[PDB]
Amino acid sequence: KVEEILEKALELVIPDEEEVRKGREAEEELRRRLDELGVEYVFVGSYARNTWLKGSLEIDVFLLFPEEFSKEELRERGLEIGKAVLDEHPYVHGVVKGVEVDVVPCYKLKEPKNIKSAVDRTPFHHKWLEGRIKGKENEVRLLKGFLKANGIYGAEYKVRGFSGYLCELLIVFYGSFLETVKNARRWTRRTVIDVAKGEVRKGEEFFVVDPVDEKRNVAANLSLDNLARFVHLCREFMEAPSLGFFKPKHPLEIEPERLRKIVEERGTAVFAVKFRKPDIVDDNLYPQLERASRKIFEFLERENFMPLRSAFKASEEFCYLLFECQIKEISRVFRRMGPQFEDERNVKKFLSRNRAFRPFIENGRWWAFEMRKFTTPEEGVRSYASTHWHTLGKNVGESIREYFEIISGEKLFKEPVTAELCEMMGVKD
Ligand SMILES: [Ca+2]
Ligand SMILES: [Ca+2]
Ligand SMILES: [Ca+2]
Ligand SMILES: [Mg+2]
């Protein structure tokens, strides 16, 4: 059955003529414009190697240069060859014949001499792959489609999954999609896949050695949990192959009343911190949302609200930090630790404070009943976000400093976070 399933999967991952047409049209046209300017360039994307996933057409053209500052010479070229345009790091993005195109500067290099490397490597990545991926393009597509349908294709921080480069290296290492999944069933968090040496060994962390640069982990951005999810999916697929593994899962359709019912049944405190989304790119925002979520989670743990799990969502205008806690309310009174009975001066100090109830000795130490300044996790977070917003990421914290609100109940359910809430609580269809 497996072999038959992969055949049907091909219809979902391979681009259809009409988009493959747009690519061709745009490529010829882009070459014409580049040639006329006598520009030295090379197509290095997934498009150039016909390994791009259906519906994901885009062109990556790198411009080869020797000098130091040409950040502007590229500004020109890109701006001149692109029908429409927008924006060391800086590059030109636009469209040509209706196709997305990235125009990046870099040094035409006499091989491995990557200057303040990053963009200078890409051409080598393409060179190494070009002659080794031929004939296995669709294998790469099945891999990408499999990953995408399961939300783990993409190395951007929003996804923390598998980069396209990583997918091609895997296909080259194992030979095909099927073989990649069969072997991935045995990957561990210490697995080192050294492509250039054709070997697998144990290491400190999951590491896929870049054949172009040994010290670089091509899977640097693949999170531990998405590696885990992939290994599991691979095991599940081989156990019972289904075309469904290549199909995106469908958004759980649930009314607010049913969400309220689930929450009331779990008996937890479910709430969110809502604030304006700061004007920064995803690769900057997402790590800040993860940090903010973690700090508040840690605050909730420390304050004994027993948080279960957290999650976040970035909409067009707002961001949401979601939490579920096992404690909806904690007592006003708490135990404040005092000094050992021996320390006379500190004991007098500890006892000099006015309190509603008398302190006491326990296990040779003084203790006092004191009052919390909040009794619900929502009140705890209102306090934390009001004075400790600086710990929530530079831009996320600054937005929260200006404005935030804690929402729960039907109000919360109305926000565009239902999918994140369901996922967080493990709600099923
Ligand atoms: Ca995500
Ligand atoms: Ca995810
Ligand atoms: Ca209260
Ligand atoms: Mg691109």
GROMACS .gro file of C-alpha atoms and ligand atoms in nm:
model
  433
    1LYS     CA    1   0.000   0.000   0.000
    2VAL     CA    2   0.282   0.237   0.098
    3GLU     CA    3   0.423   0.260  -0.253
    4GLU     CA    4   0.074   0.341  -0.382
    5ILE     CA    5   0.020   0.610  -0.119
    6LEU     CA    6   0.341   0.788  -0.223
    7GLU     CA    7   0.212   0.794  -0.581
    8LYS     CA    8  -0.101   0.981  -0.473
    9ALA     CA    9   0.107   1.207  -0.248
   10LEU     CA   10   0.298   1.316  -0.558
   11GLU     CA   11  -0.017   1.492  -0.683
   12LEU     CA   12  -0.014   1.708  -0.370
   13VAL     CA   13   0.354   1.800  -0.360
   14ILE     CA   14   0.444   1.847  -0.729
   15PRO     CA   15   0.363   2.196  -0.869
   16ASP     CA   16   0.099   2.206  -1.143
   17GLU     CA   17   0.197   2.315  -1.496
   18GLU     CA   18   0.044   2.663  -1.454
   19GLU     CA   19   0.273   2.759  -1.165
   20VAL     CA   20   0.568   2.580  -1.324
   21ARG     CA   21   0.487   2.808  -1.618
   22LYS     CA   22   0.505   3.124  -1.411
   23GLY     CA   23   0.847   3.018  -1.288
   24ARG     CA   24   0.984   2.959  -1.637
   25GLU     CA   25   0.843   3.287  -1.768
   26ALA     CA   26   0.992   3.483  -1.477
   27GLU     CA   27   1.329   3.310  -1.496
   28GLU     CA   28   1.391   3.386  -1.864
   29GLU     CA   29   1.278   3.745  -1.815
   30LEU     CA   30   1.494   3.793  -1.505
   31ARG     CA   31   1.797   3.650  -1.685
   32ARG     CA   32   1.743   3.887  -1.978
   33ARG     CA   33   1.741   4.190  -1.750
   34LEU     CA   34   2.040   4.069  -1.552
   35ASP     CA   35   2.236   3.983  -1.865
   36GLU     CA   36   2.179   4.327  -2.021
   37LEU     CA   37   2.343   4.483  -1.714
   38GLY     CA   38   2.633   4.241  -1.752
   39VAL     CA   39   2.565   4.109  -1.402
   40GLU     CA   40   2.737   3.799  -1.259
   41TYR     CA   41   2.470   3.583  -1.092
   42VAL     CA   42   2.340   3.238  -1.004
   43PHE     CA   43   1.994   3.102  -0.921
   44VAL     CA   44   2.031   2.916  -0.593
   45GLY     CA   45   1.685   2.844  -0.467
   46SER     CA   46   1.464   2.540  -0.458
   47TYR     CA   47   1.340   2.674  -0.792
   48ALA     CA   48   1.682   2.637  -0.953
   49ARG     CA   49   1.695   2.266  -0.859
   50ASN     CA   50   1.326   2.194  -0.926
   51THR     CA   51   1.284   2.075  -0.567
   52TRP     CA   52   1.022   2.337  -0.464
   53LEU     CA   53   0.692   2.231  -0.310
   54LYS     CA   54   0.367   2.276  -0.501
   55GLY     CA   55   0.235   2.626  -0.442
   56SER     CA   56   0.563   2.754  -0.298
   57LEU     CA   57   0.730   2.896  -0.613
   58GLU     CA   58   0.994   3.165  -0.553
   59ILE     CA   59   1.329   3.263  -0.705
   60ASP     CA   60   1.658   3.323  -0.523
   61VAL     CA   61   1.915   3.507  -0.736
   62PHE     CA   62   2.250   3.581  -0.579
   63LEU     CA   63   2.481   3.845  -0.726
   64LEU     CA   64   2.855   3.761  -0.718
   65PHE     CA   65   3.088   4.044  -0.590
   66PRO     CA   66   3.448   4.103  -0.474
   67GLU     CA   67   3.452   4.451  -0.306
   68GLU     CA   68   3.343   4.525   0.054
   69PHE     CA   69   3.052   4.767   0.030
   70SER     CA   70   2.822   4.704  -0.265
   71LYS     CA   71   2.514   4.688  -0.046
   72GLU     CA   72   2.405   4.963  -0.282
   73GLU     CA   73   2.527   4.817  -0.610
   74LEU     CA   74   2.281   4.537  -0.538
   75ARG     CA   75   2.022   4.791  -0.431
   76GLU     CA   76   2.051   4.918  -0.787
   77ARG     CA   77   2.053   4.588  -0.977
   78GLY     CA   78   1.766   4.439  -0.780
   79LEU     CA   79   1.562   4.758  -0.800
   80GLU     CA   80   1.632   4.772  -1.174
   81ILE     CA   81   1.551   4.408  -1.257
   82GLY     CA   82   1.246   4.379  -1.032
   83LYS     CA   83   0.903   4.494  -1.154
   84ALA     CA   84   0.816   4.584  -0.795
   85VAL     CA   85   1.056   4.605  -0.499
   86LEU     CA   86   1.077   4.613  -0.120
   87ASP     CA   87   1.335   4.545   0.151
   88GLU     CA   88   2.579   4.206   0.577
   89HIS     CA   89   2.202   4.125   0.581
   90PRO     CA   90   2.006   4.360   0.345
   91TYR     CA   91   1.873   4.227   0.012
   92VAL     CA   92   1.608   4.315  -0.248
   93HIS     CA   93   1.272   4.135  -0.266
   94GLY     CA   94   1.012   4.179  -0.536
   95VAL     CA   95   0.828   4.033  -0.832
   96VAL     CA   96   0.900   3.954  -1.197
   97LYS     CA   97   0.630   3.819  -1.428
   98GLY     CA   98   0.422   3.759  -1.117
   99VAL     CA   99   0.687   3.555  -0.934
  100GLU     CA  100   0.846   3.636  -0.598
  101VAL     CA  101   1.217   3.700  -0.630
  102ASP     CA  102   1.495   3.762  -0.382
  103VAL     CA  103   1.807   3.944  -0.507
  104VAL     CA  104   2.096   3.899  -0.267
  105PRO     CA  105   2.458   4.028  -0.277
  106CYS     CA  106   2.754   3.803  -0.194
  107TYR     CA  107   3.109   3.737  -0.311
  108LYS     CA  108   3.179   3.526  -0.618
  109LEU     CA  109   3.419   3.307  -0.439
  110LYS     CA  110   3.717   3.114  -0.549
  111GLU     CA  111   3.562   2.843  -0.324
  112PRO     CA  112   3.555   2.818   0.063
  113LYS     CA  113   3.661   3.168   0.158
  114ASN     CA  114   3.326   3.284   0.300
  115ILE     CA  115   3.380   3.641   0.421
  116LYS     CA  116   3.188   3.713   0.744
  117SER     CA  117   2.991   3.423   0.602
  118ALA     CA  118   2.618   3.367   0.589
  119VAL     CA  119   2.508   3.476   0.246
  120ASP     CA  120   2.843   3.375   0.094
  121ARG     CA  121   2.768   3.007   0.177
  122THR     CA  122   2.443   2.978  -0.015
  123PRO     CA  123   2.613   2.947  -0.354
  124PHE     CA  124   2.821   2.654  -0.222
  125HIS     CA  125   2.513   2.496  -0.069
  126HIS     CA  126   2.361   2.507  -0.415
  127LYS     CA  127   2.677   2.375  -0.585
  128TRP     CA  128   2.706   2.075  -0.351
  129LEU     CA  129   2.337   1.989  -0.393
  130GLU     CA  130   2.297   2.053  -0.765
  131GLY     CA  131   2.481   1.743  -0.886
  132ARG     CA  132   2.365   1.518  -0.603
  133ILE     CA  133   1.992   1.589  -0.588
  134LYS     CA  134   1.928   1.532  -0.959
  135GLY     CA  135   1.668   1.260  -1.011
  136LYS     CA  136   1.543   1.281  -0.652
  137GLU     CA  137   1.359   1.612  -0.679
  138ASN     CA  138   1.021   1.453  -0.609
  139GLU     CA  139   1.170   1.266  -0.312
  140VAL     CA  140   1.251   1.609  -0.166
  141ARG     CA  141   0.898   1.724  -0.244
  142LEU     CA  142   0.741   1.432  -0.063
  143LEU     CA  143   0.957   1.513   0.239
  144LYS     CA  144   0.861   1.882   0.234
  145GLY     CA  145   0.494   1.803   0.179
  146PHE     CA  146   0.501   1.551   0.466
  147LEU     CA  147   0.662   1.810   0.695
  148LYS     CA  148   0.434   2.094   0.584
  149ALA     CA  149   0.113   1.896   0.627
  150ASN     CA  150   0.228   1.842   0.984
  151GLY     CA  151   0.332   2.202   1.048
  152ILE     CA  152   0.705   2.138   1.061
  153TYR     CA  153   0.844   2.260   0.734
  154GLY     CA  154   1.042   2.579   0.769
  155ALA     CA  155   1.338   2.681   0.981
  156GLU     CA  156   1.199   3.029   1.063
  157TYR     CA  157   1.150   3.090   1.436
  158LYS     CA  158   0.774   3.084   1.397
  159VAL     CA  159   0.801   2.719   1.293
  160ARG     CA  160   1.137   2.590   1.424
  161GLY     CA  161   1.110   2.303   1.179
  162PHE     CA  162   1.304   2.163   0.882
  163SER     CA  163   1.467   2.403   0.636
  164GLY     CA  164   1.449   2.324   0.266
  165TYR     CA  165   1.826   2.280   0.272
  166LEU     CA  166   1.792   2.022   0.550
  167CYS     CA  167   1.532   1.830   0.346
  168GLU     CA  168   1.760   1.808   0.042
  169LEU     CA  169   2.058   1.696   0.253
  170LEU     CA  170   1.841   1.425   0.410
  171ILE     CA  171   1.723   1.297   0.073
  172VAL     CA  172   2.081   1.286  -0.050
  173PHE     CA  173   2.193   1.103   0.262
  174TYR     CA  174   1.919   0.839   0.261
  175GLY     CA  175   1.839   0.828  -0.108
  176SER     CA  176   1.463   0.877  -0.093
  177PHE     CA  177   1.167   0.994   0.115
  178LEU     CA  178   1.069   0.643   0.223
  179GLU     CA  179   1.423   0.559   0.338
  180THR     CA  180   1.447   0.891   0.523
  181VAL     CA  181   1.134   0.817   0.725
  182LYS     CA  182   1.229   0.453   0.790
  183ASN     CA  183   1.563   0.557   0.943
  184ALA     CA  184   1.430   0.867   1.122
  185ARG     CA  185   1.228   0.629   1.336
  186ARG     CA  186   1.556   0.564   1.514
  187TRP     CA  187   1.686   0.921   1.546
  188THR     CA  188   1.760   1.045   1.898
  189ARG     CA  189   1.819   1.385   2.054
  190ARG     CA  190   2.193   1.306   2.031
  191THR     CA  191   2.196   1.192   1.668
  192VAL     CA  192   2.465   1.343   1.445
  193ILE     CA  193   2.410   1.306   1.071
  194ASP     CA  194   2.742   1.382   0.902
  195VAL     CA  195   2.650   1.399   0.534
  196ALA     CA  196   2.998   1.468   0.400
  197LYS     CA  197   3.135   1.156   0.575
  198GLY     CA  198   2.832   0.942   0.502
  199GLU     CA  199   2.800   0.850   0.868
  200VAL     CA  200   2.572   0.872   1.172
  201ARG     CA  201   2.715   0.895   1.521
  202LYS     CA  202   2.627   1.009   1.870
  203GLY     CA  203   2.685   1.367   1.979
  204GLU     CA  204   2.574   1.634   2.225
  205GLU     CA  205   2.261   1.726   2.031
  206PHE     CA  206   2.077   1.657   1.707
  207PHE     CA  207   2.325   1.779   1.451
  208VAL     CA  208   2.320   1.762   1.072
  209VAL     CA  209   2.669   1.852   0.955
  210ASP     CA  210   2.672   2.097   0.665
  211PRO     CA  211   2.893   1.935   0.398
  212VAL     CA  212   3.009   2.284   0.302
  213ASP     CA  213   3.111   2.377   0.660
  214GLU     CA  214   3.170   2.109   0.927
  215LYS     CA  215   3.107   2.336   1.222
  216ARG     CA  216   2.757   2.427   1.107
  217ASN     CA  217   2.444   2.240   1.216
  218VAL     CA  218   2.200   2.255   0.925
  219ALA     CA  219   1.923   2.163   1.173
  220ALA     CA  220   2.023   2.437   1.418
  221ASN     CA  221   1.666   2.575   1.425
  222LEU     CA  222   1.480   2.243   1.439
  223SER     CA  223   1.343   2.240   1.793
  224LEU     CA  224   1.384   1.932   2.012
  225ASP     CA  225   1.007   1.890   2.016
  226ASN     CA  226   0.960   1.909   1.639
  227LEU     CA  227   1.241   1.654   1.596
  228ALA     CA  228   1.045   1.439   1.843
  229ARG     CA  229   0.720   1.498   1.654
  230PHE     CA  230   0.887   1.405   1.323
  231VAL     CA  231   1.032   1.082   1.468
  232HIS     CA  232   0.688   0.988   1.600
  233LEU     CA  233   0.513   1.076   1.273
  234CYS     CA  234   0.766   0.861   1.090
  235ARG     CA  235   0.695   0.568   1.321
  236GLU     CA  236   0.320   0.619   1.281
  237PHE     CA  237   0.340   0.648   0.902
  238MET     CA  238   0.535   0.325   0.861
  239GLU     CA  239   0.294   0.153   1.102
  240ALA     CA  240  -0.011   0.257   0.897
  241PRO     CA  241   0.064   0.466   0.587
  242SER     CA  242  -0.214   0.705   0.490
  243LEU     CA  243  -0.241   0.988   0.238
  244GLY     CA  244  -0.364   1.183   0.539
  245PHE     CA  245  -0.006   1.237   0.654
  246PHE     CA  246   0.035   1.459   0.349
  247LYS     CA  247  -0.285   1.650   0.409
  248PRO     CA  248  -0.315   1.952   0.640
  249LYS     CA  249  -0.523   1.881   0.949
  250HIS     CA  250  -0.851   2.070   0.978
  251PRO     CA  251  -0.914   2.350   1.232
  252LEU     CA  252  -1.127   2.213   1.514
  253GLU     CA  253  -1.469   2.374   1.483
  254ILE     CA  254  -1.596   2.445   1.832
  255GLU     CA  255  -1.846   2.698   1.965
  256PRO     CA  256  -1.751   2.917   2.264
  257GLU     CA  257  -2.006   2.736   2.482
  258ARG     CA  258  -1.832   2.402   2.422
  259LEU     CA  259  -1.495   2.558   2.500
  260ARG     CA  260  -1.637   2.698   2.824
  261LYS     CA  261  -1.771   2.349   2.900
  262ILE     CA  262  -1.432   2.188   2.842
  263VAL     CA  263  -1.259   2.446   3.060
  264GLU     CA  264  -1.516   2.417   3.340
  265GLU     CA  265  -1.485   2.036   3.317
  266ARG     CA  266  -1.105   2.055   3.345
  267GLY     CA  267  -1.164   2.287   3.640
  268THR     CA  268  -0.867   2.506   3.552
  269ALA     CA  269  -0.801   2.875   3.518
  270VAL     CA  270  -0.767   2.954   3.149
  271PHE     CA  271  -0.673   3.305   3.046
  272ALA     CA  272  -0.467   3.524   2.813
  273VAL     CA  273  -0.260   3.841   2.820
  274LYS     CA  274  -0.364   4.045   2.517
  275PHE     CA  275  -0.152   4.335   2.388
  276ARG     CA  276  -0.065   4.518   2.067
  277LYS     CA  277   0.171   4.339   1.835
  278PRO     CA  278   0.492   4.542   1.811
  279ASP     CA  279   0.611   4.641   1.461
  280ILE     CA  280   0.892   4.391   1.413
  281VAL     CA  281   0.953   4.090   1.190
  282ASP     CA  282   0.845   3.737   1.283
  283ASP     CA  283   1.199   3.612   1.348
  284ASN     CA  284   1.226   3.889   1.605
  285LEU     CA  285   0.871   3.871   1.748
  286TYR     CA  286   0.836   3.497   1.792
  287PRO     CA  287   1.144   3.452   2.012
  288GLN     CA  288   1.013   3.740   2.223
  289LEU     CA  289   0.669   3.574   2.252
  290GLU     CA  290   0.835   3.249   2.362
  291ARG     CA  291   1.039   3.437   2.623
  292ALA     CA  292   0.740   3.635   2.756
  293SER     CA  293   0.534   3.315   2.776
  294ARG     CA  294   0.815   3.136   2.964
  295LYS     CA  295   0.878   3.416   3.216
  296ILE     CA  296   0.509   3.438   3.303
  297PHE     CA  297   0.485   3.059   3.319
  298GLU     CA  298   0.782   3.060   3.557
  299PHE     CA  299   0.621   3.337   3.762
  300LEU     CA  300   0.303   3.130   3.786
  301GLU     CA  301   0.504   2.824   3.898
  302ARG     CA  302   0.686   3.028   4.165
  303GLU     CA  303   0.360   3.174   4.294
  304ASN     CA  304   0.218   2.823   4.320
  305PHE     CA  305  -0.065   2.851   4.066
  306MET     CA  306   0.062   2.528   3.910
  307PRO     CA  307   0.054   2.624   3.545
  308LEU     CA  308  -0.015   2.328   3.315
  309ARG     CA  309   0.082   2.469   2.982
  310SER     CA  310   0.117   2.789   2.783
  311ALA     CA  311   0.088   2.903   2.423
  312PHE     CA  312   0.085   3.221   2.218
  313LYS     CA  313  -0.064   3.366   1.904
  314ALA     CA  314   0.022   3.666   1.691
  315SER     CA  315  -0.264   3.814   1.493
  316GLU     CA  316  -0.248   4.113   1.260
  317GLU     CA  317  -0.286   4.371   1.535
  318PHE     CA  318  -0.259   4.184   1.864
  319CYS     CA  319  -0.054   3.917   2.038
  320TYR     CA  320  -0.189   3.667   2.291
  321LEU     CA  321  -0.001   3.485   2.567
  322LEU     CA  322  -0.226   3.193   2.669
  323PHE     CA  323  -0.210   3.000   3.000
  324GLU     CA  324  -0.394   2.722   3.184
  325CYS     CA  325  -0.342   2.678   3.558
  326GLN     CA  326  -0.450   2.408   3.802
  327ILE     CA  327  -0.517   2.664   4.075
  328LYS     CA  328  -0.801   2.914   4.017
  329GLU     CA  329  -0.764   3.060   4.365
  330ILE     CA  330  -0.505   3.046   4.642
  331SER     CA  331  -0.552   3.153   5.006
  332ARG     CA  332  -0.484   3.510   5.112
  333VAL     CA  333  -0.259   3.385   5.395
  334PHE     CA  334   0.085   3.239   5.326
  335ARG     CA  335   0.391   3.144   5.533
  336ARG     CA  336   0.680   3.391   5.543
  337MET     CA  337   1.007   3.231   5.656
  338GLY     CA  338   1.188   3.396   5.946
  339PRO     CA  339   1.526   3.340   6.112
  340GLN     CA  340   1.657   3.054   6.326
  341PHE     CA  341   1.565   3.106   6.693
  342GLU     CA  342   1.932   3.163   6.780
  343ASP     CA  343   1.973   3.492   6.586
  344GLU     CA  344   1.850   3.734   6.849
  345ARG     CA  345   1.872   4.056   6.647
  346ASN     CA  346   1.706   3.918   6.339
  347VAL     CA  347   1.432   3.759   6.549
  348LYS     CA  348   1.353   4.094   6.711
  349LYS     CA  349   1.347   4.250   6.363
  350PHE     CA  350   1.121   3.973   6.227
  351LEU     CA  351   0.883   4.018   6.522
  352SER     CA  352   0.877   4.400   6.520
  353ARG     CA  353   0.655   4.398   6.210
  354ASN     CA  354   0.283   4.446   6.269
  355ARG     CA  355   0.079   4.147   6.147
  356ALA     CA  356  -0.283   4.028   6.185
  357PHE     CA  357  -0.173   3.693   6.326
  358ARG     CA  358   0.109   3.589   6.563
  359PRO     CA  359   0.428   3.442   6.419
  360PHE     CA  360   0.544   3.101   6.541
  361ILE     CA  361   0.839   2.868   6.581
  362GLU     CA  362   0.863   2.550   6.375
  363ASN     CA  363   1.161   2.318   6.340
  364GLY     CA  364   1.381   2.567   6.521
  365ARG     CA  365   1.293   2.860   6.294
  366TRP     CA  366   1.050   3.151   6.315
  367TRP     CA  367   0.767   3.182   6.063
  368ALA     CA  368   0.488   3.434   6.014
  369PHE     CA  369   0.150   3.427   5.845
  370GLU     CA  370   0.139   3.716   5.598
  371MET     CA  371  -0.100   3.820   5.320
  372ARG     CA  372  -0.057   3.773   4.944
  373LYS     CA  373  -0.129   4.072   4.721
  374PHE     CA  374  -0.328   3.853   4.479
  375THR     CA  375  -0.521   3.528   4.502
  376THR     CA  376  -0.590   3.427   4.143
  377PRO     CA  377  -0.343   3.354   3.865
  378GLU     CA  378  -0.505   3.636   3.661
  379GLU     CA  379  -0.436   3.886   3.943
  380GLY     CA  380  -0.085   3.751   3.977
  381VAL     CA  381  -0.016   3.812   3.608
  382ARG     CA  382  -0.172   4.160   3.614
  383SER     CA  383   0.084   4.241   3.882
  384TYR     CA  384   0.378   4.077   3.708
  385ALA     CA  385   0.310   4.230   3.363
  386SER     CA  386   0.261   4.574   3.521
  387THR     CA  387   0.607   4.588   3.683
  388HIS     CA  388   0.814   4.316   3.520
  389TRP     CA  389   0.734   4.379   3.153
  390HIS     CA  390   1.106   4.437   3.095
  391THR     CA  391   1.165   4.064   3.130
  392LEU     CA  392   0.917   3.991   2.848
  393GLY     CA  393   1.140   4.069   2.552
  394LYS     CA  394   1.248   4.419   2.447
  395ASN     CA  395   0.957   4.500   2.213
  396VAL     CA  396   0.692   4.271   2.360
  397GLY     CA  397   0.767   4.417   2.704
  398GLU     CA  398   0.745   4.776   2.576
  399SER     CA  399   0.405   4.710   2.418
  400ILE     CA  400   0.278   4.550   2.739
  401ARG     CA  401   0.414   4.849   2.930
  402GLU     CA  402   0.183   5.069   2.724
  403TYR     CA  403  -0.120   4.840   2.734
  404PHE     CA  404  -0.234   4.488   2.811
  405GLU     CA  405  -0.544   4.317   2.943
  406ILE     CA  406  -0.605   3.979   3.101
  407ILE     CA  407  -0.897   3.804   2.938
  408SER     CA  408  -1.084   3.488   3.026
  409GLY     CA  409  -1.416   3.315   2.964
  410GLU     CA  410  -1.646   3.389   2.673
  411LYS     CA  411  -1.451   3.709   2.619
  412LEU     CA  412  -1.137   3.501   2.564
  413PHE     CA  413  -1.316   3.250   2.343
  414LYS     CA  414  -1.426   3.532   2.111
  415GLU     CA  415  -1.065   3.627   2.034
  416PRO     CA  416  -0.891   3.455   1.740
  417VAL     CA  417  -0.712   3.202   1.965
  418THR     CA  418  -0.950   2.905   1.960
  419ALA     CA  419  -0.705   2.684   1.767
  420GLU     CA  420  -0.424   2.758   2.012
  421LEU     CA  421  -0.653   2.696   2.311
  422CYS     CA  422  -0.768   2.359   2.176
  423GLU     CA  423  -0.416   2.250   2.092
  424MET     CA  424  -0.292   2.362   2.436
  425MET     CA  425  -0.558   2.156   2.614
  426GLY     CA  426  -0.538   1.855   2.381
  427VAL     CA  427  -0.895   1.892   2.259
  428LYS     CA  428  -0.986   1.647   1.986
  429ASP     CA  429  -1.232   1.628   1.698
  430CA      CA  430   0.433   2.796   1.545
  431CA      CA  431   0.430   2.421   1.570
  432CA      CA  432  -0.848   3.832   4.480
  433MG      MG  433   1.339   3.345  -0.104
   0.00000   0.00000   0.00000
